[model samples]
Target: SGGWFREENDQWPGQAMSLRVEKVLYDAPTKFQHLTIFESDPKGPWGTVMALDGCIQVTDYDEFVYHEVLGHTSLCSHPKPERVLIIGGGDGGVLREVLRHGTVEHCDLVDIDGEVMEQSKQHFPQISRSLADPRATVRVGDGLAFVRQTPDNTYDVVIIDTTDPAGLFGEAFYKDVLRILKPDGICCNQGESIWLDLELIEKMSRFIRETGFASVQYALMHVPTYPCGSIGTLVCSKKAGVDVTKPLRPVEDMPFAKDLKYYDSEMHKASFALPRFARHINN
Candidate 1:
């Protein structure tokens, strides 16, 4: 006997994605939100799926695509990213990808929910393996507060990996992020899908610009499990001239480049080229 796991989102009403679940690995409500993990039917492409608050967060089959694009797009855009700050990636997927860069001296991950990390470590070890990396410092607290207290020009790159509804998308939060970043630091956040959340994405893009980021760009990646079968990353640079789309550090030079599944020098450049309808997102 099997069941179908349906992911429904208010943002995209009247539609839902349903996947056949072979088995339920974990199902419970965490301190911050409801969490569920299950194995998709062997016949489908999705291997294991994790959902938070009824939204599909990640799937084992496409985890690398999102993580690599978000992590490397920012890290490689900057000439050097020695100290990085990750807000709300409790699953450690982004942290793992960040540490793949030899230049990263330290990465601080601040997530509000500790149970999410625990669950990820237990059920998604492959994605959360970097939590134990010496360069990674896992902290359980408010990411907005952490950013506010962090000294100015403290991090080379700052990544916001929180969910959309977590209230992390605001002018004040982005102002603090701009304050804490180095003069040439870059920032990347989990931008919702172009197909489903274009209005929110446009608003966020404008808000980020108003928050004083010199350059803001949106990049897309495919994730079958997510709404609209895709998601995006919002890349912002403190310095005006920096092109966040082109990789300053080529993937070929990275020792771990061979291990990546979805990111390449060409793909990195192409991600920034938006569709005709979404051209005004950066303006």
Candidate 2:
């Protein structure tokens, strides 16, 4: 079993998060990434989900905050979301949140790592259960290529649950995503942390808008596993006069409302409530 060690994530230097390892649940190097699982709490930092490249991809305890915000923000923003796609969330957490909406007819999950999907399905059942749902499609393929092949204006909502832009599939990835989205479709992708990646957030927001997206906004959520214990998601609409800040469909009376842990009407609007520094670049 591995012992105490600081995670070697230099994304935010000077301050790094460390955790205690009670046991090594799993450890191996896949074709694409190194995967690790630890069994312990740092006085209380228990690890439950999987990790890639020394960075925690998903944690069991507070995962709802990240996953819910990533998936639900875009889904709720759409007026009548039916066909949804999740890129690079092989862990299936995104699918679980996306499938919660009864309005979705089909959900497609594409990730480059097939081993990540198989291992996560075995050990992370609480977060990965939706992988087997009849409404979902699990595909082992390149996300960029998949989007390139997808018909234009096909998906009502597309969730890019992958890593940062530098590590994203490619530079043209976001452009292809918009091409596949309907005129009024919504797209949400991880925007990292404002404290650590403010410039990157501004760059990405600009990239989406430059690609002709209607409305582009950066939103946030607190996730301890990630740098700064907080992360942001960029929500952009495809049509000329769309507002991702306002939800077209309310979650209040919906059957899935009770299941949501972090997203609600107030939070939906509040997520877009960017600090002035971010607002300057966000707009």
Candidate 3:
């Protein structure tokens, strides 16, 4: 056997990314989804890899880039993010980054798949260690229903860390997010890749703006294992004139600044700088 794990998706037909698997740590069908965890070749840099339903969810080596960009892009932009809500980040990587802010008083992470949360705690301690922080409340439930049942103006920020936006993540879901956010609240969702999913990104950007968000922008980040070697986040602000391109709180001033592998204040501003062909998304 070649011992290589090849990733194939209908969205990116005819193209595949393969990684050498040194060992399989866990492979089972959870109550909600199929989960697989494997150790990559020690000679390479990916280290441990977690794939959900055959898609590369995260790798131990460069996961910081994904987590930090999604978490801090909105967190650092807001004047003060005291209460935050994370939808579908069961692995706790985004939650770990959210808690790094001293302004955060409490955070609630709701994901439908509890098994993913449990497995991440067991295998990815470095990324999931903050799941047990006193300030965090981890729950297993449908994120759309949770947002619907939540009170208006509840959260200062909401981060949607779910898999490809579809099904439960429709226009109504984003409408509810707008309803639940404070007047000045910000929301960030996984925006896929500019190279491959440009049409979807543009469609999402338009619909989110029509959903009544005062400002909507697409932010990019580098993830070596992901398709096209990159991904993006859709950042939306509830109030007019809220610029997500600038960071309100500089990372250099934060205690954990030195620990961050990606997403510095400079990178924060640069992420919103879209390429020429993709610049129409924000319009």
Candidate 4:
């Protein structure tokens, strides 16, 4: 479904509701990720969960893809990562991935909206169970303020997972992202897809650079929840000349559950491969 289409629920238990998915075309669309457009009836902005898979909570989607990428991508490349912080991702997708390393000494997840976190625990437990880890500290607060108070250069890898940018609010936080990171720290915050918003993508790239990261780059994914056919991700690091590349197979020879739906040895490397437009923009 390259574009959004409507899934009408004419016969619900008691009421009728429809899901409308539309196509979004942009001149300078995101290079790596696809974007789709959905329209709501009697619309306010509220909508359904953005399933990582193209379908709604369908089995085909791999929650592992998200967790693995965020957990290993930056954390693995860091050479040494004992502490991690994940902001947003109330769904618990990112934290679950972070724990896989076993090397992680402490994992902190800060999600301001406790409701979404609780909602996910009730509805999406497969990915949310790691919240029970004693080493994991789950806090409810504004990520911006949380970052501001953090000790300098403390985190080895900081993952920020939240809604896409609509305005300067997202913009303001981008600045804070760079500050909280250690001088030698590596940041693998959520890099949005190119198809979804080119301007915002470009803006994020610049923001990473301004924050002191010498380089900024992203990866590609087929996240079904996005508006277009795809979704993208960006990664930045404070240390100059940091390697954005990661091993295809888990370096420890530990590949996630093979039956795991998305990430595999080959696909792992390929996900971070930048397409033409993405390469050009970040080149």
lDDT of each: 0.87, 0.81, 0.89, 0.62
Judge candidate 4 at residue 207 and give its lDDT.
69
Worst 10 residues of 4 by lDDT: 24-33
TM-scores of all candidate predictions against the true structure: 0.96, 0.93, 0.96, 0.73
Q: Is candidate 1 or candidate 2 better by lDDT?
A: 1
TM-score comparison, 1 vs 3, better candidate = 3
Task: Give residue 117's error in model 3 in angstroms.
Answer: 1.0
Cα deviation of 241, candidate 1, in Å: 1.5
lDDT head-to-head 3 vs 4, winner:
3
Model 3 stretches astray by more than 4 angstroms: 164-169
- Please tell me which model should have the higher TM-score, number 3 or number 4: 3
> Sorted on TM-score, highest at the top, how do the candidates line up?
3, 1, 2, 4
- Give the alpha carbon lDDT tens digit for every residue of 7-26 in model 1: 76576578877889998998
- Write model 3 residue lDDT over 27-59, tens digit each, in one string: 888887779999999999999999987789989
Full candidate order by lDDT, most accurate first: 3, 1, 2, 4
Q: List clashing residue pairs in candidate 3.
A: none
Which digits, one per residue and each the tens of the lDDT, describe model 4 over residues 1-283?
Answer: 4333433232223422234443222112222222222332224332323332122321113455666667767766676678889987667877887787767899888876565555467556777888888889999777777777887767888887765321136556666666667677778767655754676778777867876677877767775434453566677777887657665226456554454456554665687676676676457
Q: After superposition, how far is residue 159 of candidate 2 from its true place, in Å?
A: 0.6
Q: What's model 2's lDDT at 26? A: 80
lDDT of 2 by residue, 30-85 (tens): 86888887666646755575668777777778888888898888998898999999
Cα displacement (angstroms), candidate 3, residue 13, comes to: 1.4
**Candidate 2 — which residues are off by over 4 angstroms?**
42-47, 164-171
Q: Model 2, 217: alpha-carbon shift in Å?
A: 0.4
